[model samples]
Target: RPDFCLEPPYTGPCKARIIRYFYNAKAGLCQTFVYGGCRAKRGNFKSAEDCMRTCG
Candidate 1:
């Protein structure tokens, strides 16, 4: 799993395996996301660390 995102509503297709990260306001966990191989949100990232840093 890699390139996580904010939360659901963006499950994505193909299912190539991406680290979905998002600061679960309810759970209390900062998360991150990335866009690659296809068009992704600007906020999206390309590395797990990026996601963790930005997302987490």
Candidate 2:
């Protein structure tokens, strides 16, 4: 059998855009695998780096 990997992981600028959409709207925040029920309690973390840290 051949070994296979998920490859790429899909974490990139586009994913960041999706995160931003969820953050601003606060609608699709409860869907696991896509943002995963996480909301920004405050208007903090202007950039993705900051958001990643907050989420992490």
Candidate 3:
């Protein structure tokens, strides 16, 4: 579940410009998430290209 970190009340990452990532099952390929303000986990990305480069 590439969260998009969208925990409501907080829309999505676009507003924050912070992104996260992961390669999930059922979804296949790559997916995106919204990072708060730090690089916490391994499955996190700065940009879509960065996400692709990491898990693609």
Candidate 4:
């Protein structure tokens, strides 16, 4: 079963700052987590476009 469910769903920036914070916590290049029924993944941004794509 799914870990959680979102009624309206998330359709906005993925919050890269928070994701980076989490990544630093465990010393991982990338990290993924489930919050408020939304899937968030964080990693090094190859370029501004990439970061925007991931977080905005």
Candidate lDDT scores, in order, read 0.47, 0.30, 0.49, 0.31
lDDT of 2 by residue, 3-56 (tens): 111111122333233333212233412122332224433323345554444433
What lDDT tens digits, residue by residue, belong to model 3 across residues 1-56? Answer: 34542222222334465645655544555566565664355555556566555554
Task: Candidate 4: count the clashes.
Answer: 0
**Model 3 segments more than 4 A misplaced:** 1-17, 48-56
Error of 1 at 14 (Å): 2.1
Indicate the worst ten consecutive residues by lDDT in candidate 2: 1-10
**Backbone clashes, each candidate:** 12, 1, 2, 0
TM-score of 2: 0.24
Query: Which ten residues in a row are the worst by lDDT in model 1?
Result: 1-10
lDDT (C-alpha) at residue 1 in model 3: 33
Candidate closer to the true structure by lDDT (higher is better), 1 or 3? 3
**Model 4, which residues run further than 4 Å from truth?**
1-41
Query: For model 1, how does the per-residue alpha-carbon lDDT over 1-56 read when each residue is reduced to its tens digit?
Result: 33343444244554455654444445545454432334444345455465556655
Q: Can you give the lDDT of residue 6 in candidate 2?
A: 15
Estimated TM-score for each candidate: 0.37, 0.24, 0.44, 0.24
Indicate the worst ten consecutive residues by lDDT in candidate 3.
5-14
RMSD of each: 6.6, 14.7, 6.8, 13.1
Q: Best-fitting candidate, measured by TM-score?
A: 3
User: Which segments of model 2 are wrong by more than 4 Å?
Assistant: 1-44
Q: lDDT value for candidate 2?
A: 0.30
